[model samples]
Target: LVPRGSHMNPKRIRALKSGKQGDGPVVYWMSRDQRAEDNWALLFSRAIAKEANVPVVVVFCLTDEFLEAGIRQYEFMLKGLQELEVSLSRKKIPSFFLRGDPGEKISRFVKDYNAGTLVTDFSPLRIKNQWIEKVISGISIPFFEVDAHNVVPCWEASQKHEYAAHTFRPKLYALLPEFLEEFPELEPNSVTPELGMVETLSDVLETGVKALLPERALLKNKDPLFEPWHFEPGEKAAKKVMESFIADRLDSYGALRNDPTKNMLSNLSPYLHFGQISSQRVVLEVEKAESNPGSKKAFLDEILIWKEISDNFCYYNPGYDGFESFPSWAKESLNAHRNDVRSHIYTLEEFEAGKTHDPLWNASQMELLSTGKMHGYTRMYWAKKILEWSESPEKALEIAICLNDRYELDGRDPNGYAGIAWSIGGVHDRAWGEREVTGKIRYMSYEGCKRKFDVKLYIEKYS
Candidate 1:
């Protein structure tokens, strides 16, 4: 049973099927958050089944055509899911892997299983929200939504889209102590079921979990630039990365994180992006580390404040990835500078090939292509340069989002979208001194980067 304080907060549950309860098992449709431990959605599913005196089952829908994601991102996610399935099985919970349209599959799954209740992890992206809307229309059973991803649930963090970090920081910190408690251990199911429920459930046990993943042949065409060794996938690996970061890198993070040459990063983005670990767990561990107080504070600000605002942006603003989402002043500034003559231009092909005239920009692209990640400092420069080279502000955003989603391991995430928006459209950033292509939107230059670090050395490393 869930402990008193660890039970789901009423505010964290959005009752989609209000006043309705099912007569069968509780089905947790895991989507955004994909871990067996520290998962509030899965915990809620278990609690609901316990209260109803029925069993609980877990399911994840796999689609080959998820936005702009390709083999690199898919490989990372599927590998993590493979580990999750084993963990869930160890707890006596059955996980069903479904392919194709989730809306159709999830609705039919609950109906076939005679599921009494349906619960899902929250995601603010447009596509996931669309799937939820379709599932709502199709399912007649009781349904609930849980914010398992954020340190403070996204909706509960703030009601409206926040203007900037300064505005949202106070509200987030005010509620932090209340929600940042340790996770309740998810207990094994009290009831068991035969494999007679569905043929799909039986197939998972017959064949290895590999049978559920995409074909290896299909993923073989991955770009030569890709070096998958940068980050390992799954929950156990995620915890290891967190432990190493706190022990090795946290002390120098505040002083050297902005310099791309120093390996001061936590290197946890890919794991964090895939829901392999919870931000709350990361924060709790970091707080106990004997690092510089300033460094800990800075890292927490990024992992908590900066990261959650991306969800807030996408949740509240429908056009979070578009120029329309830019602040009023930013819109005006960009519009006024639309036709400014650029000194250089490159097509998406040229940019993707790392053939740009600037060696520094080319090196950043090479880093993204080769490692499936670019330095956090270079990401700002990379997106800003995309804005500089593209023909229009709208075109700049389109190209930047497309390439980023296609390449980065953490691509298509809310953080990627918000970071790109901030660089190109100034979503959460303020106006700076006007420039040619970027206007009042903040600008980064090769000269400024040179002043900060050894530019030639970085470019040569990637080259």
Candidate 2:
């Protein structure tokens, strides 16, 4: 068994040990971390259950109002849960699927089951934090949080949001010895609960259909080839995607990661966002691969510079996505260009419909349309161009965020907001020389695009 402190919460250990008197079962509220394995929260719950000789149950609350989430994102998660149910069943543990606000669902479940304590995975986002707060405020039982998503828990990594990569990287590195240890092997429950058969995703779908009121109608429009969703889900599929990236193109990632046409980068952000795969697992597996130094460095930099930085940005600047958070220089410059004559100003619908005159921008939009993802570098250009084409920076920011959150599977996330802010409002960027459209906000022109990659091929690929 892995040492308790290795990947376990010390407070949770205390709570479990102190509250051993209750006859209630243990509830593992699986929100952020969706997978069965490599989940510290699940492991912690199982350990507590085994020690207390009480049954352990896993629960997932499905909420449709998730920002920019539609049928496409729902279908993907449903498919993943379908597989998760099978995996959990094999371990003889009961898995429950409920729909509603997570805080409400969790409270109701805990009350119904007479759960002694509730354990959930950690989330830094505002919505998730609010839900947890609601639960803690309303519930009588101890509610413990497990840091399963980040290698170092957000709270433990730093007290406040970090300013930049340089500030946060060293702090993270210092904590590596304590937080980067291998996850402990999960021990299956020897005492299986005699609860009746659990409901599967198919069963839930039927129930959802029947329970829907007249105003809430079933969706008729969806893609058949893509599993009726814009993205794929499930632990099996997530692992497959990871393996495919490692086996096929990871070695060439150094040279091709920035080339939009090559598609060399691993499209794992959605999975990571949903906690289908842990960042630790990704890091460990990638390091194990026999990749060249350049390839390894290229991929690792994304994890450090991009993913970690975005997390830091959100943590430090609660208003990272808001217009007020823009640097003074950027705000002033954007205001200066606010009334400047635009070559063209497109409506939100026009942008969403890929009606922009610029072929490269149109192609980028199309990429997001067909697949719920975009090439990373092209995404920067895409947002900057929106600022150029809009009448004002505020409008540009709104349009960029709207399109991103509405289309991208991983939108509405800290990364998405920070990325858009950096592109349009220069939140984490410095002033550049004055320009007509961008002003002091850093400018990225089509000519710069031409210098970077095969511009024509990129346009042709998506066109």
Candidate 3:
């Protein structure tokens, strides 16, 4: 009953798998976005299956390793998928969890089942791009890509690297009214596959990580900090998170969002990062919340403008995490101050251990170490302190990114890159007063943080 391209843009689909035999189950290669509800990629795949009179199967291919991912990150995703398996089953869409590279494994799965078309979610990372290429080269069937992650699809948002949120905001807002409509209920797929039996979620849970990530040896289970998961993992859990935030605190968000100690912020970044929740879905709900207009606009700014700008940045800029990706002024400013005498320099290990001289900096690091997260506002201060304390600008950027990717559930995400760049290299940030280590890059300080909120309590709570 779902119309083609109702909530999704046909432009989001790009042929990746190849050929014209168009007659088997549509395989949605679930990559970036993992959830069932509010997932355009999954919905689009089912629509294609319905039109072609074929079954729709959601295939999630797991790699032996992903960039700096550890036990906690994998657990969150696998557990979400475990729930996803059940959700997909109710709608008559079979979910498959295959182990190996997408290029090799996904292509093989497509060929093995004689799948007519391969549809995949979007990722703006190098490894994923390579995987897509590998799959494209090997597959003879039709392949398509969808950007279920963004309100406006990444490619559709803009074709070039956006300079800042302000510059990108208007461009995206122009498209949002057309693109942010409600999603249709997924039409239950009737066709069923005749392939060999697939493993159950329980079975996959029992030995999944072991079979795939034996090379991981240990998943770095013991972090110095631990993220408290008041929220569960799944599409339903993701909705609960949004609903709770809207009911309990949407009105107070503008007042408390910037405070490190307040519980006012909607902690949905981790879910959004892992694709457990859709940004568009979040956008729609927040926009509808009966809260102060200022608060509502503030919420929209963080999720819509800022988040989309980050995705657009990574999508168009190949050097998103690279030093070269910084604005020319930022690069020159930092380089000009590169050899400035450091007040103190710390090794990556030292920083990782939260052994910094500043107590406030130590708290932020420990927050990340113990909980895999730091307060959003504290993040800028944390990265800025690293730049000030590290041996060089390059070293600061390296250590900051490394720790973030290895610990935070939302680490290794485009937002991390964009935010870090803004902090360390001034991406989307204006240059400020020149200093020894920071040059013209904006600066943050422990004293400045102390003035904003209770530094003692934040340090005490996380410590």
Best by TM-score: 1
lDDT of 2 by residue, 54-164 (tens): 877888887767765655566566666777877887777778877779878777777776786688887657888778767765567766677777777666677775645
Of the two candidates 2 and 3, the one with more favorable lDDT, higher being better, is 3
Candidate 1 vs candidate 2: which has greater lDDT? 1
| Model 1 steric clash pairs | 22-116
TM-scores of the models, in the order given: 0.96, 0.89, 0.95
Residue range 190-299, candidate 1, lDDT tens digits: 79866444544445546554555556425635567689888999999999999999989999999999999888999999888888999889998998888999899999
Clashes of 2: 1
Q: What is candidate 3's lDDT per residue for 51-122, written digit by digit as tens?
A: 888898888888867888877677777778877887888887877777878879888887877888888998
What C-alpha lDDT does candidate 3 achieve relative to the native structure? Answer: 0.82
Give the residue spans of candidate 3 off by over 4 A.
Answer: 1-8, 197-203, 206-221, 224-229
Models sorted by TM-score, best on top: 1, 3, 2
